[PDB]
TrEMBL record, chain B:
It comes from the Eukaryota. The A chain is responsible for inhibiting protein synthesis through the catalytic inactivation of 60S ribosomal subunits by removing adenine from position 4,324 of 28S rRNA. The B chain binds to cell receptors and probably facilitates the entry into the cell of the A chain; B chains are also responsible for cell agglutination (lectin activity). In the N-terminal section; belongs to the ribosome-inactivating protein family. Type 2 RIP subfamily. Belongs to the ribosome-inactivating protein family. This is Ribosome-inactivating protein. Might form dimers or tetramers of disulfide-linked A and B chains. Glycans are attached at N97. It comes from Momordica charantia. Disulfide bonds join C20-C39, C61-C78, C148-C163, C189-C206. Residues 8-131, 135-260 form the Ricin B lectin domain.
């Protein structure tokens, strides 16, 4: 499996991991005018999951199962235990981590659900190397007080970073500055709109690259930038891949 | 899902020096020419796109006025284009008449410059941002070894230095004409060599040239589509303090870039 370890966790190794994660996810991707790969859709459940290993500073490893259709965590394994999101595809338990003791977590893999169960938002949750390491630890032992927040950390540092070069670069900046950060409007506006940006880019084929609806992406000065077309570098050199939406 | 086939969209079109595409004096007569003008909320800078490949302001269709190059682009009655294929907009913001291959061009940078249909040479003066938001996008440009492009030698050269958040010369303004401009001196543009003997990318006064037209591609290169080449760290060595134009190849990571805004 593709993996990242605390033994060798640098700006370079993080970048390589995210780079290869995008590659695996975009196998068999379709492409439009924008030339941003669109993820696979209608994937048979047997091939719908991509396994990624993360290893903490205790050399204990979790394996996360990423759904290749939407780049979200469906489940994870730690040793002989596994844990499924409440909205994982129902047949997934017959395909992944079958030789383990399977549990269903009390919430969905969306930020909205995780924040409600965690009682804590992405805006208040620091990201960085220690928080990455700590989250793998909390998931490995499955300490329920920390599971939700650990997912906020890892969904963002792995999946949102994969989805967006701007987010990858925030993490790189924290790694080599050794300085934690909490996501601001720039980062959260990206996370929030990945699906809408997918729909609009794909819909824009019929309107010369112009969107049906404008999307507000914030810059690092907290100014909103209306992206109503594919002609914005903050979108088209940022979003690494899209959710399938339109034929 | 009706959202996959939107029926229209109204936006603005900006380009050379951040100026907007504007029907001169809001004149509705057929053949009323289109100009550069400072961007504003007026209806004669609102452009509606339709799935028939038309682009419309004041109820009439943007169009070339001749088969040959150098004539004004105008608005005209949309019924005259009844059988026409219309406008095609490239990935990089070239707006092309599909039949004649002429492209929307601004031969000067000043307000009230007439826009013309010309042969495409991929000049910056032929690059357009279709979009409601017309402002230059202030950013850092991150390259090899996670270093930042910096304007050096009194804003005449450019090379990689380690990123420092305060550092005024590590900031660039990406403009609607595909230019990459020094953030605290917006008359200066990142430019491909004007000397045949050199491949060195440098900083020069903006002139709308092919040399100053850059495209941030989804594959993470900074492409000059006129010279079919990309920005590259010389020898993949940041300590040479030289960024050059090269044909695209995955030899190292010297051709990979990030826009951090
Ligand atoms: C695109 O270019 C061609 C001109 O080269 C236009 O087609 C001509 O339009 C004129 C003016 O109405 C007609 O008299 C000619 O008969 C057309 N010639 C051809 C070759 O079709 C067309 O109008 C332009 N379209 C746009 C949207 O600019
Ligand atoms: C821009 O378009 C209008 C409409 O055709 C022209 O009249 C302009 O011509 C220029 O200005 C006129 C007033 C006259 O001086 C003429 O000889 C000029 O060339 C034209 N402007 C240009 C070409 O700069
Ligand atoms: C909005 C509009 O149509 N304006 C026209 C018109 O006038 C100008 C004006 C408005 C306020 C203060 C001074 C001038 O006519 C102008 C030509 O004289 C020009 O077409 C302008 O765009
Ligand atoms: C805890 C929670 O919000 N559960 C939701 C549920 O409402 C919805 O049926 C499901 C859709 O996949 O997503 C999850
Ligand atoms: O001088 C030209 C100007 O005329 C008026 C109009 O509001 C402007 O948009 C511009 O066309």
């Amino acid at each position: 499996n593709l993996s990242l370890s605390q033994s060798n966790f640098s700006a370079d190794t993080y970048k390589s991991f995210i780079k290869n994660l995008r590659k695996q996810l975009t196998i068999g991707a379709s492409y439009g005018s924008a030339g941003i790969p669109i993820l696979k859709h209608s994937v048979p459940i047997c091939e719908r999951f991509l396994l990624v290993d993360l290893t903490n500073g205790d050399n204990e490893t979790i394996t996360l199962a990423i759904n290749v259709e939407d780049a979200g965590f469906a489940a994870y394994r730690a040793a002989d235990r596994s844990y499924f999101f409440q909205n994982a595809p129902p047949i997934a338990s017959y395909v992944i981590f079958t030789d383990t003791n399977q549990n269903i977590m009390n919430f969905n893999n969306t930020f909205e659900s995780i924040e409600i169960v965690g009682g804590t938002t992405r805006s208040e949750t620091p990201l960085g190397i220690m928080h990455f390491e700590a989250s793998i630890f909390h998931l490995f032992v499955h300490d329920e007080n920390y599971v939700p927040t650990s997912f906020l950390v890892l969904i963002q540092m792995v999946l949102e970073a994969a989805k967006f070069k701007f987010i990858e670069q925030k993490v790189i900046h924290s790694i080599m500055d050794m300085e934690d950060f909490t996501p601001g409007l720039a980062m959260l506006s990206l996370e929030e709109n990945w699906t809408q940006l997918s729909l609009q880019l794909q819909a824009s084929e019929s309107l010369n690259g112009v969107f049906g609806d404008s999307v507000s992406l914030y810059n690092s000065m907290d100014e909103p930038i209306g992206v109503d077309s594919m002609y914005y570098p903050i979108l088209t050199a940022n979003m690494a891949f899209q959710l399938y939406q339109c034929p | 899902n009706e959202q996959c086939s939107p029926q229209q969209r109204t936006t603005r079109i900006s380009g050379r020096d951040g100026l907007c595409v504007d029907v001169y004096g809001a004149l509705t007569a057929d053949g009323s020419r289109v100009i550069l003008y400072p961007c504003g909320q007026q209806q004669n800078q609102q452009w509606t796109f339709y799935p028939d490949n038309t682009i419309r302001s004041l109820g009439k269709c943007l169009a070339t006025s001749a088969l040959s190059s150098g004539s004004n682009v105008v608005i005209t009655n949309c019924d005259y284009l009844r059988y026409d294929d219309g406008w095609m907009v490239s990935s990089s913001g070239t707006m092309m008449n599909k039949s004649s291959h002429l492209v929307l061009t601004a031969n000067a940078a000043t307000s009230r410059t007439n826009l013309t249909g010309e042969n495409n040479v991929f000049a910056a003066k032929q690059a357009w941002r279709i979009g409601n938001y017309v402002e230059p996008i202030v950013t850092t440009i991150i390259g090899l070894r996670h270093m930042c492009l910096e304007a050096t030698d009194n804003d005449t050269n450019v090379w990689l230095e380690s990123c420092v958040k305060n550092k005024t010369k590590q900031y660039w303004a990406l403009y609607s004409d595909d230019t990459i401009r020094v953030n605290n001196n917006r008359n200066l543009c990142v430019s491909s060599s004007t000397d045949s003997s050199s491949k060195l990318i440098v900083i020069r006064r903006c002139d709308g040239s092919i040399n100053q037209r850059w495209v941030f591609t989804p594959q993470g290169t900074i492409s000059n589509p006129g010279y079919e080449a990309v920005m590259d760290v010389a020898q993949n060595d940041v300590y040479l303090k030289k960024i050059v134009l090269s044909s695209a190849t995955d030899k190292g990571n010297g051709q990979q870039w990030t826009v951090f805004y």
